[PDB]
Ligand binder design. Structure first.
Ligand SMILES: Nc1ncnc2c1ncn2[C@@H]1O[C@H](COP(=O)(O)OP(=O)(O)OP(=O)(O)O)[C@@H](O)[C@H]1O
Ligand SMILES: [Cl-]
Lengths: 48, 298, 183, 108, 48, 256, 473
């Protein structure tokens, strides 16, 4: 509801255990997408 | 000033003085010799079904495994852990004599580590969370008692428990305990000297303020030594990088850090006494305690 | 709203917050308890308790102005709330602010049992909740005894109100004695 | 008065309690609905009170004053002369009439 | 510690059947504790 | 309408409700709420409590509830006050203080624990009879009064008869189980012991019921196969006896 | 009683035989050295071990009870010692008083398992009052320490700590009296100093509660006891310095709620912390050098502990601050709360704060012998103190005229209020500070000080020597 949830912060203290700080690294590929990520590889960060 | 002889006071005040003296002189010496002396053999003595000692150890393990935030005081654990430690701590030579002493020590230790005391020691050190208390002291003494001489079986049991369980609380508590260890401080020593000079008699706690909890420090580092005793490569490596755990604690570096802190305190003490001609009794006492701790760390 | 999806989700969530069986070994039981408490904390932090309360309020508003399905949905919501806060001191302390809401919903016949379960969980776990219990709430519980029949879980709740983990609350004891006994 | 006395077993009809006397009486008090709330015969201990000191509720004292030695009678204490708006919490509800089966054992 | 019970009167075989133990009211049902018996205890007339 | 209480032997719903009612009674008057205890004496009185504790056909849960209710209303507060002031020994100095001896004779054989003269200072407890005709709270004084001479004799008699029917082959234990037969009586005995009601002969009888050979001048509870609840009660009694021995030693030291 | 001293011990051997025999008999009684048991210890040990061997105990509480009892069977001497440590023999004359004391103490102890309320608060207040009024409380302080009175009251206070200020006040008064009684009680209460200082900010604002706050208990713990004062740790003083610094920035919330003007700092609690630090430093007419150094270092690290006047940037000086305070006092609009018991006056509060601060600093100044011995720390501290307050400010403050009562023509005495005016109590610390620091060593300086400062005060005191004005406060 609140639009402020769209914002990204470097909040510290008690936020390393919450679930709002979990990100998923999704490569730009369907086959072998569960393989190792290389430096400079393009991906997407999804908020869980 | 011979104006208040004992025959000029009411019997109740003199009786209070008599009770204080009786506790302080006659009974205190007796208490040390006889305590739990005839109990441990009967607990180990025989009549699938666990022994009474096995049952008390399992009770302590279950209490240790339960999740909490602070290790609440437990006099029963303290008394029984002290009793077990004194059980193991039984007390040039012929080769046969030394070999028989070794065998007797191994048998006494196996009376306890075959009933789950190694795991109990590890769990109680994990459960302390890093706060010193009588339970931690008794736990370290019991671990030293069942590890003395470098007991390979107990080391294998402890390493298997720590690896299978992925117990990262044990090493967090070890790191906290090491960081809480006390070193020589000159401020308390100067305050003690000032109080002595003014005339006040320094109490035992005041004396212990200068180098505080040195017995616990030596017990902690003796335990850590006995984990690697006999060149146990598995435990020598595991104490550096705990592979498989969520978080790793380096115990070599922690010991080195405490060594540096103690070295700095000792150098400060030496700078204090460099100007003076001779070292008084208190200075020698504190130097001896610091040297004992340093020898254990080395 | 898809009723079947809501029903399946509520059943799966209630099975998700399921305490370990008492027969389990001590180490496994403790691991299960720790994981369950972690999941309860994760759900509470994301405002799932507030969402459950809002869903309950909306269902009650809808019923005030598919009856069996919605009754089942409301019962499952109460069970899910109890499963979320059961055995978790922080969740119960958070829910202590809604004692008036809970007691006000005690009256209705359908909601009385789930409300009693939730309230007993709160009283057992939250030690400060007993400090927020006033005379009106005690009278509401006693009136529940009077209007729903002789159910001994209400008496369990009253006993919980009287003694708070070894500390006696004189106000609760006096209120219960004065309002339940003389009649 | 606010107390209605109904005789059960007569006394001597001559010896009545006086000032500065202890009235050893065995009683059994119940609510107007038939719910017993007190009885000195269960405890095996007769109740003693002194007239004129206002130790007991007004209706009880007046009824015992009217009663004679060795007399068993029923006293109906209305809420005016027995608590009233505030009764014994947890025992006697507010505005409750009380009925006592009072026997005047002794006047000593 | 409870008053002795003693009532005398008439009763009807149609429905006057008191069993020992607990019954109507506070138990201790005698002659005059139902509508089939008509009793007298020296002070009151009992029926129902 | 009213039924017999013993008819609750087969009505589990009413039995559960009344058992929890007794629990609620014990709870409201908990931790020295003497006013609510006086109020409860207007609901369950001494005659009912004595009948309930003595009755043998009562269901075990109701039996336990009645024992607990008696202890709460009449006995719990005194025991708690005695337990608060138990780790300190304030001894006046008089001839009675000097008379205490470590041993009862020249043979130097241990006496019975808990038997003898006590020189430590222990404040007394005040009881008042629960009368609802008296106006004012001045009459009320701490917990309601109980005879304490009928009660302790009845407790000793009940314990004796329970022990004499403690065979493993018996098929109708009082209350439905050995737990429901022994735990209530043992709780009452421990409460009366800590309150210091039993005299030397009562303590001698209790000790003979515990172990006749050790405390001599049946087999005994300790040598009998008991559930763990009865074991907890026995452990508590033994703890009290150890406390009595320690107090005796302290008083002997002070006299010497 | 020391029988190992041989001829050194003056006890005849005939008497020593009795003690040896009693000790042997006692150790035999305590059990200290397959058979059927013959005593309680053997019975208990055999029963516990047989129960443990017969079946595996499935109840945790039963396991704990069994093994506690079994272990206690082999600790007779330890329990006997712990019992003797709490034994106390009294005289037959005090039996009634001690019975009353024990009854009150038991009533208080039994309320530690009850939720605090109005009735419970009254019960505990009355119980503490009865205990304090008891003769045995201050005739047998050792008895009070044996009974653990202070531990019980500390438990009550910890529970309360704030919707029950009266309970806290009663506990604090009791503990202050407890400390005042004997030095042993003072050393016993010294153990709670860290907790007492952690809650030192309770009840300071209310003026009528002086001596009934945790800070007052902490001060009573360390007061004219050199041994305990030397034992103060640096963080303990650091807490009080932090509270004082906070008082030096934010206005008093209670004063603002009551309507007092927002002067911008709290000159009322800061005085309290300064008084505690004064007790910490100055012991028995002789400053403690270690605590003096620590306090000065802590204060200098945080200049706001000196208040707005002594801050480096924008500071107007101590004399300017005192004159501003007097101006505030003369104007009712600037000190008293708005129109819309012991009313707090802002001007006198500011004056008292500065007087307490200067008193503390002057008591922190090094002793003369330490300076003459060549210690660098003493010279450093004296130099810091001199840099903080110049002699011009001290001499100006001492020169501020007072408002003393005057005899009216009608025959009635007009006595100015001593709670909202500059008073001689605010000049005494300056004379101290001007003396321990900035020692009077020049004849011209002494004569100037006597001409401007002291002579008008002497004249005023002489003038107030009439029959009517001589007795005024
Ligand atoms: N998540 C994705 N986001 C963007 N492009 C994607 C994604 N997944 C696959 N692609 C597209 O697929 C190609 C790279 O993936 P890859 O070659 O492994 O896929 P694929 O096996 O051929 O299947 P598909 O064509 O369905 O993606 C590029 O065209 C990339 O644009
Ligand atoms: Cl995802």
């Amino acid at each position: 509801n609140d639009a402020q949830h769209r914002r990204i912060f470097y909040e510290a203290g008690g936020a390393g255990t919450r679930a709002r700080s979990l990100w998923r690294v999704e490569p730009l590929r369907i086959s072998w997408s569960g393989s190792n990520i290389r430096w400079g590889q393009a991906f997407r960060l999804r908020h869980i | 000033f011979r104006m208040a002889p004992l025959y000029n006071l009411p019997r109740h005040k003199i009786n209070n003085f008599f009770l204080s003296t009786f506790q302080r002189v006659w009974l205190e010496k007796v208490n040390e010799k006889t305590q739990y002396d005839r109990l441990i053999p009967i607990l180990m003595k025989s009549p699938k079904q666990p022994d009474p000692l096995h049952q008390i150890i399992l009770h302590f393990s279950r209490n240790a495994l339960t999740e909490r935030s602070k290790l609440e005081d437990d006099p029963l654990y303290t008394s029984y852990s002290s009793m077990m430690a004194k059980s193991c701590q039984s007390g040039e030579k012929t080769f046969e004599e030394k070999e028989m002493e070794k065998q007797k020590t191994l048998y006494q230790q196996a009376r306890l580590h075959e009933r789950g005391a190694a795991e109990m020691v590890l769990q109680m050190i994990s459960a302390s969370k890093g706060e010193m208390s009588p339970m931690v002291v008794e736990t370290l003494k019991l671990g030293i008692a069942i590890l003395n001489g470098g007991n390979a079986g107990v080391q294998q049991k402890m390493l298997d428990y720590l690896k299978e369980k992925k117990d990262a609380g044990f090493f967090q508590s070890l790191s906290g305990l090491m960081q809480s260890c006390s070193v020589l401080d000159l401020n308390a020593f100067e305050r003690q000297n000032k109080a002595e000079g003014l005339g006040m008699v320094t109490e035992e706690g005041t004396r212990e303020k200068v180098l505080q909890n040195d017995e616990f420090t030596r017990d902690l580092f003796r335990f850590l030594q006995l984990l690697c005793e006999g060149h146990n490569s598995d435990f020598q490596n595991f104490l550096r990088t705990q592979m498989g755990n969520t978080t790793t604690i380096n115990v070599i570096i922690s010991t080195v850090d405490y060594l540096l802190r103690l070295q700095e305190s000792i150098s400060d003490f030496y700078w204090y006494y460099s100007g003076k001609d001779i070292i008084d009794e208190s200075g020698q006492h504190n130097f001896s305690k610091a040297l004992a701790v340093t020898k254990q760390i080395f | 709203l898809p009723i079947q999806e809501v029903l399946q989700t509520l059943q799966d969530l209630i099975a998700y917050f399921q305490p370990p069986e008492e027969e389990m070994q001590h180490e496994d039981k403790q691991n299960k308890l720790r994981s369950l408490k972690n999941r309860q904390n994760l759900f509470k932090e994301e405002g799932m308790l507030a969402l459950v309360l809002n869903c309950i309020d909306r269902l009650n508003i809808y019923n005030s102005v598919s009856g069996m399905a919605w009754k089942e949905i409301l019962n499952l919501l109460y069970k899910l709330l109890a499963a979320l806060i059961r055995g978790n001191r922080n969740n119960c302390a958070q829910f202590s602010n809604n004692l008036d809401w809970l007691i006000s919903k005690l009256d209705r016949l359908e909601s009385s049992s789930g409300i009693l379960e939730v309230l007993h969980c709160i009283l057992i776990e939250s030690p400060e909740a007993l400090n927020l219990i006033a005379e009106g709430h005690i009278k509401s519980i006693i009136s529940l005894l009077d209007k729903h029949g002789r159910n001994h879980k209400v008496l369990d709740v009253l006993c919980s109100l009287c003694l708070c983990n070894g500390v006696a609350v004189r106000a609760n004891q006096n209120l219960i004695c004065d309002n339940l006994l003389p009649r | 008065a606010g107390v209605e006395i109904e005789t059960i077993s007569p006394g001597d009809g001559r010896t009545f309690p006086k000032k500065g006397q202890t009235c050893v009486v065995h009683y059994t008090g119940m609510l107007q609905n038939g719910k017993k709330f007190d009885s000195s015969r269960d405890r095996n201990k007769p109740f003693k009170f002194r007239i004129g000191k206002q130790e007991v509720i007004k209706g009880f004292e007046e009824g015992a004053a009217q009663m004679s030695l060795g007399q068993r009678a029923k006293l109906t204490c209305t809420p005016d002369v027995a608590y009233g708006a505030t009764g014994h919490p947890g025992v006697i509800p507010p505005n409750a009439t009380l009925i006592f089966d009072v026997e005047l054992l002794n006047l000593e | 510690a409870e008053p002795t019970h003693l009532r005398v009167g008439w009763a009807s075989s149609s429905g006057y059947a008191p069993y020992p133990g607990g019954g109507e009211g506070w138990g201790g049902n005698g002659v005059g504790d139902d509508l089939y018996s008509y009793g007298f205890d020296g002070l009151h007339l009992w029926s129902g | 309408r009213c039924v017999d209480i013993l008819e609750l032997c087969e009505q589990e719903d009413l039995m559960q409700f009344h058992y929890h009612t007794l629990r609620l009674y014990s709870a409201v008057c908990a931790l020295g709420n003497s006013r609510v205890a006086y109020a409860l004496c207007g609901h369950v009185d001494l005659s009912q409590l004595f009948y309930a504790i003595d009755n043998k056909y009562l269901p075990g849960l109701l039996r336990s509830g009645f024992y607990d209710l008696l202890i709460s209303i009449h006995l719990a507060n005194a025991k708690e006050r005695k337990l608060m002031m138990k780790n300190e020994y304030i001894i006046p100095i008089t001839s009675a203080t000097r008379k205490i001896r470590l041993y009862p004779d020249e043979s130097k054989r241990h006496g019975l624990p808990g038997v003898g003269l006590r020189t430590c200072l222990k404040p007394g407890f005040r009881f008042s009879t629960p009368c609802f005709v008296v106006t004012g709270e001045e009459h009320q004084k701490q917990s309601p009064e109980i005879p304490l001479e009928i009660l302790k004799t009845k407790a000793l008699s009940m314990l004796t008869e329970a022990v004499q029917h403690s065979g493993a082959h018996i098929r109708d234990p009082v209350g439905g189980s050995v737990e429901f037969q022994f735990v209530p009586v043992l709780k009452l005995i421990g409460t009366l012991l800590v309150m210091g009601v039993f005299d030397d002969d009562d303590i001698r009888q209790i000790l003979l019921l515990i172990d006749p050979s050790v405390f001599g001048e049946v087999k005994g509870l300790l040598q009998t196969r008991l559930p763990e609840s009865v074991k907890l009660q026995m452990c508590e009694l033994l703890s009290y006896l150890c406390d009595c021995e320690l107090q005796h030693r302290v008083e002997a030291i002070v006299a010497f | 009683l020391n029988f190992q001293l041989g001829e050194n011990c003056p006890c005849p051997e005939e008497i020593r035989e009795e003690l040896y025999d009693f000790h042997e008999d006692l150790l035999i009684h305590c059990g200290v050295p397959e058979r059927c048991p013959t005593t309680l210890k053997e019975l208990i040990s055999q029963t516990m071990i047989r129960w443990a061997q017969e079946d595996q105990i499935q109840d945790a509480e039963l396991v704990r009870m069994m093994f506690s009892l079994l272990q206690r069977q082999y600790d007779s001497i330890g329990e006997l010692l712990q019992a003797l440590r709490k034994t106390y023999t009294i005289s037959q004359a005090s039996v009634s008083d001690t019975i009353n004391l024990l009854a009150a103490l038991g009533q208080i102890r039994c309320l530690l398992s009850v939720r605090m309320g109005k009735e419970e608060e009254l019960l505990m207040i009355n119980g503490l009052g009865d205990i304090m009024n008891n003769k045995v409380f201050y005739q047998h302080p050792n008895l009070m320490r044996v009974l653990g009175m202070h531990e019980t009251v500390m438990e009550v206070m910890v529970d309360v700590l704030i919707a029950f200020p009266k309970m806290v006040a009663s506990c604090c008064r009791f503990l202050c009296y407890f400390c005042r009684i004997s030095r042993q009680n003072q050393k016993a209460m010294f153990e709670h100093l860290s907790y007492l200082l952690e809650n030192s900010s309770v009840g300071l604002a209310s003026p009528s509660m002086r001596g009934s706050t945790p800070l007052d208990v902490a001060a009573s713990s360390v007061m004219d006891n050199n041994e305990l004062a030397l034992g103060l740790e640096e963080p303990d003083l650091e807490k009080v310095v932090t509270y004082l610094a906070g008082c030096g920035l934010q206005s008093c919330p209670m004063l603002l709620a009551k309507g007092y003007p927002d002067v911008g700092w709290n000159p009322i609690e800061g005085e309290r912390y300064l008084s505690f630090l004064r007790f910490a430093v100055f012991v028995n007419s002789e400053s403690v050098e270690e605590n003096a150094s620590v306090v000065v270092k802590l204060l200098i690290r945080r200049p706001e502990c000196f208040g707005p006047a002594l801050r480096g940037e924008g500071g107007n000086g101590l004399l300017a601050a005192m004159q501003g305070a007097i101006k505030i006092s003369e104007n009712p609009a600037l000190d008293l709360p708005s129109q819309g018991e012991e009313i707090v006056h802002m001007g006198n509060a500011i004056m008292s704060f500065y007087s307490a601060l200067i008193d503390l600093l002057g008591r922190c100044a090094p002793e003369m012998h330490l300076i003459q011995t060549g210690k660098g720390e003493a010279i450093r501290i004296r130099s810091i103190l001199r840099s903080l307050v110049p002699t011009e400010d001290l001499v100006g403050i001492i020169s501020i005229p007072l408002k003393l009562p005057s005899l009216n023509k009608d025959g009635s005495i007009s006595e100015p209020d001593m709670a909202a005016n500059f008073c001689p109590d605010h000049k005494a610390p300056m004379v101290l500070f001007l003396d321990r620091v900035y020692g009077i060593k020049d004849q011209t300086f002494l004569l100037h000080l006597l001409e401007v400062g002291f002579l008008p005060d002497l004249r005023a005191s002489a003038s107030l020597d009439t029959v009517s004005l001589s007795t005024t406060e």
